[PDB]
DNA sequence: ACGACAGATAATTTGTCACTGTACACTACGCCTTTTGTGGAGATGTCTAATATCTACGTTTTAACAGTGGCCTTATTAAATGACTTCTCAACCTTCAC
């Protein structure tokens, strides 16, 4: 059933801030650079943003917020 | 792309040790109520054998006397006594004697 995110920490808000920018509809000719302009503000390599968006789709806002 | 090798790295628990909040300060099984089955007199009710009493049952004994039954010989003549009965209870005249 439903899992609701609450008490998001500020680095999770940073994760939200990229996710809300990647939510603009894109294609391979646009994903790569619109990802990279986020990777530079995540300050971490592209593949982590891939796992971030993976977990975001896999679990939502509670996917980008770490589980103990 | 993603995810897939060996290894980094942010947790996660294990273990130290300075610090502090707290009890020890004697102070619950005890006060009080109700039910309740067991128990001790103690007034009262229960109801008999029996040793008379208390007359009668009537039943013996007495004597009094009543009735039955046996016996008792009968004659004559005399006497005494007491009685009974019957009969009787004249009257004038003549004759011879003094």
CB of A5 within 8 A of CB of A16? no
A63 φψ region: left (φ > 0), alpha (ψ -120 to 50), beta (else): alpha
Tokens linked to A11 = 């680095």
Is the minimum distance from the CB of A32 to strand B below 7 Å? yes
Q: After which residues is chain A broken (C to N over 2.5 A)?
A: none
Tokens linked to A61 = 């806002």
Residue A52 (CA) to nucleotide B46 (C1'), in angstroms, measures 114
- Resolution of the entry in angstroms: 2.3
Experimental method reported for this structure: cryo-EM
User: What gap in Å lies between CA A66 and CA A13, rounded to an integer?
Assistant: 12
Is the minimum distance from the CB of A44 to strand B below 7 Å? no
Is the minimum distance from the CB of A36 to strand B below 7 Å? no
């Amino acid at each position: 059933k439903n899992v609701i995110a609450t008490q998001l920490s500020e680095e999770a808000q940073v994760k939200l801030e990229v996710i809300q920018s990647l939510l603009e509809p894109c294609d391979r000719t646009t994903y790569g650079q619109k990802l990279r302009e986020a990777a530079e503000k995540l300050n971490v390599s592209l593949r982590t943003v891939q796992r971030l968006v993976k977990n975001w789709e896999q679990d939502g806002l509670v996917g980008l917020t770490q589980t103990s």
